[PDB]
Amino acid sequence: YQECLGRMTFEIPEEMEWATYDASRVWQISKGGGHNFTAEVTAVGDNGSYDYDSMIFYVSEKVDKNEFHNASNYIKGTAEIYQDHLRENIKLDKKAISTLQKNKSIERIKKGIAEMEAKIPLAKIYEHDLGIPDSHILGSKNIPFHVLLWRNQRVYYFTFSKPTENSAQRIKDLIARFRTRELYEVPNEPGICFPYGFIADDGKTAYELKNSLRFTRTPNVIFSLLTASANDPWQTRPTSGLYDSDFRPGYDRQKWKKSALLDSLHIGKRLAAFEGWRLDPRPDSGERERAWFGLAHTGGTLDPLVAIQVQTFQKGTDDLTDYTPPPEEVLPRLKALSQSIEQR
Secondary structure, three states: OEEEEEOEEEEOOOOEEEOEEOHHHHHHHHHOOOOEOOOOOEOOOOOEEEOOOOEEEEEEOOOOHHHHHHHHHHHHHHHHHHHHHHHHHHHHHHHHHHHHHHOOHHHHHHHHHHHHHHHHHHHOOEEOOOOOOOEEEEEOOOOEEEEEEEEOOEEEEEEEOOOOOOHHHHHHHHHHHEOOOOOOOOOOOOEEEEOOEEEEOOOOOOEEEEEEEEEOOEEEEEEEEEEEOOOOOOOOOOOOOOOOOOOOOOOOOOOEEEEEEEEEEEOOOOEEEEEEEEEEEOOOOOOOOOEEEEEEEEOOOOOOEEEEEEEEOOOOOOOOOOOOOOHHHHHHHHHHHHHOOEEO
16 A cells, blocks of 8 residues: 655555645746645645756646746736836836946946846747647747646646756657656556656666645644755755754743653664754643654665655644644554555
């Protein structure tokens, strides 16, 4: 009873839920942050990167086909808002130059003008027909980047950061190897998985993936899983999307005690330390809410980096109606999943 991410796979001790891009924000997937579970039950940066033309890519939860069109229309919309913004900024500096000539620096301004004046025709978005069904392929007049795919009630958004003069053909070649997938369907072929997605390939292209899981019966704990090919170009470290509010929580030291949380764990057969912190209510204060955090990782250097970030969310932080279970109830099912990890 498996599932995969990146180039590996793992069994699951029961029901689990992938974090997917928010249904209510699919219209602004163009502003891409990351998948969540809820609005506030989230890891930072749950998406995917792939060493095609610097590709970042996401996958939404099930939405109506209307959001697919909204996404495309937001891209087009913000792109002419930009132009307007450039057009007025061009004038605001032209007014600056004259205020100046009243009295070499004006030179420096006239280029900024000439260079955002050249930006204007390229800031316009157009639709490219590359003969792809149920799609919105947007881009400049010469070059496509941005691909929205409508597939099984979900939007899939791929966006290319370093496109080329040959982008049209490169986008049609890659999409050809894309394929939807369903929960627990494990491909039998070189490729990289993400939630409900898959991209067949040679097994040689560099990648970095991160997406959180949730045991459906324990919603308050999430497991951000992180994997990247060996010595990846984005230099993604085991703490990649973590940031320090996870390392030192804010708690009032008088009603909750913050004790270090130290354990050990297996990924494949390699053993790695899981070390983080832990929050529990002192016996006197009448509190039940708990919180813990933890991270294990095996590099990284001759095979893919695999890391596990765990974090906790509080009761009433969304649709969460119970207190966080303490780690001794979650960790066994985590270690079980952890040991089952293997490449494909």
